Paper text:
We determined the crystal structure of the Mamu-B*098:C14nef5 complex at a resolution of 1.76 Å. The overall structure of Mamu-B*098 was almost indistinguishable from that of other MHC class I molecules, which were characterized by two semisymmetrical domains, α1 and α2, which formed a β-sheet platform topped by two semiparallel α-helices. Continuous electron density corresponding to C14nef5 was observed in the Ag-binding groove, thus providing direct evidence for the capacity of Mamu-B*098 to bind the lipopeptide Ag. The myristoyl group and C-terminal serine residue (Ser5) were buried deeply in the groove and interacted primarily with the B pocket and F pocket, respectively, forcing the central three residues of the peptide chain, in particular Gly2 and Ile4, to protrude out of the groove and into the solvent. The acyl chain of C14nef5 did not gain access to the A pocket and was packed in a U-shaped configuration in the B pocket, which was lined with an array of hydrophobic or non-charged amino acid residues, including Tyr7, Phe22, Val24, Met45, Gln63, Val67, Ala70 and Phe74. Besides its hydrophobic properties and low electrostatic potential, the Mamu-B*098 B pocket was also marked by its ample cavity (250 Å3), which was roughly 1.5-fold larger than that of the corresponding B pockets of other known MHC class I molecules. The side chains of His9, Lys70 and Tyr99 of HLA-B27, as well as those of Tyr9, Lys97 and Tyr99 of Mamu-B*17, protruded into the cavity; however, the amino acid residues at these positions (Ser9, Ala70, Thr97 and Ser99) were all small in Mamu-B*098, allowing the folded myristoyl group to fit in the B pocket. The myristoyl group made a sharp U-turn instead of extending into the A pocket, thereby leaving the A pocket unoccupied, and the view from the A pocket towards the B pocket pointed to a highly constricted conduit between the two pockets. Furthermore, the salt bridge that was established between Arg66 and Glu163 overhung the channel, making the opening as narrow as 4 × 4 Å2, a size that hardly allowed any peptide chains to pass through.
Residue numbers in the entry:
A (entry chain C): 2 to 6
B (entry chain B): 0 to 99
C (entry chain A): 0 to 276
The structure:
Amino acid sequence: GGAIS
Amino acid sequence: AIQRTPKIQVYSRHPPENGKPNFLNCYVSGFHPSDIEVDLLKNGEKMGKVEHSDLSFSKDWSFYLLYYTEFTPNEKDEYACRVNHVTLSGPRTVKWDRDM
Amino acid sequence: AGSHSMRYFSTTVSRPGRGEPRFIVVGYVDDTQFVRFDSDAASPKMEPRAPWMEQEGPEYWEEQTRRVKDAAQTFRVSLGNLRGYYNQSEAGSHTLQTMSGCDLGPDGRLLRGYYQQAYDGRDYIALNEDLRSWTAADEAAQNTQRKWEAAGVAEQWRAYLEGECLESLRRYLENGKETLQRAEPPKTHVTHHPVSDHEATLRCWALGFYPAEITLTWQRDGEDQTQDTELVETRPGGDGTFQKWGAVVVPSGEEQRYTCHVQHEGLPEPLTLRWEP
Ligand SMILES: *C(=O)CCCCCCCCCCCCC
Ligand SMILES: [Cl-]
Ligand SMILES: [Zn+2]
Ligand SMILES: [Zn+2]
Ligand SMILES: [Zn+2]
Ligand SMILES: [Zn+2]
């Protein structure tokens, strides 16, 4: 989802 | 980055019979990265109307693609799949073996 | 079948100097593809790739397209951060792949949920089976792990994987039941090709089967000839079914000592074949 690395 | 060389299988959808419409398949798998060039060849020449599957990959993250097109096999005509990928010294050409 | 799976496989590939990274997603129920997205398409949207998907209404397609476009942006930003973590040039192409999905067990519960990423073809980070912790594959990925632990990312995946993931899978299984729930047994036969006056290739064929999982072995005197068998990778027919073969080269006079054994979930019981001239 919105979880950027 | 890792690189893996493509495996290549060339084959028909149904058992081949002369004069009967069929599908010619070139299944290319186990490669990385994803950029790859695949041509189906009739008597050495590039076939048109070749379609391919949507890019997917396996458990080890290596990619696979099916390239395919309609064909009607006859004894005169030779078929092959030619694959180029960064992991290769040059394009690899695999001839269709119709008698397995 | 007692258990089923859903998976989304996404690939993001940067192309320095040539625009935004390309983003491709495909979704599978078991071994059947049902959707795709490609950011390079004329007007990128989530699209059906199985006919039983066509009955989903436009709001389904709008939401899936929104979610994929969201992911695409996330993954483009991620590619930037990862090139930082790895101290890499902006000149080179790199690849981010993600797998996510759920297995539905026969008790109607989550058999296992998945979310994993790879960078340039190597494991990067994975959600553990417990859906509460992470495995980082290297120090760079520990950057991500730390960010994701702080942000409670695992719990968000756990909620998805136990809820909507399974609900979606159940719905697809119902909508596509006539093909998704039908295990098609392999059509099998043995071919024979002399390689000389003294030896022949025995080839055991399995054709038109679904799903793709199958075991094909040659045996001689009740023992697997695995280290003498050429076994090709299971391959798509192109019509939703799969194909495989395995071959052994044998002395002509001992051809009848060899039997091919085929296991498939579509078979009542394992098949045993032989060369029958
Ligand atoms: C963030 O990392 C986006 C991951 C998408 C979560 C799945 C939501 C369900 C819809 C399927 C979209 C799959 C996009 C890869
Ligand atoms: Cl996009
Ligand atoms: Zn194309
Ligand atoms: Zn089932
Ligand atoms: Zn709307
Ligand atoms: Zn032969």
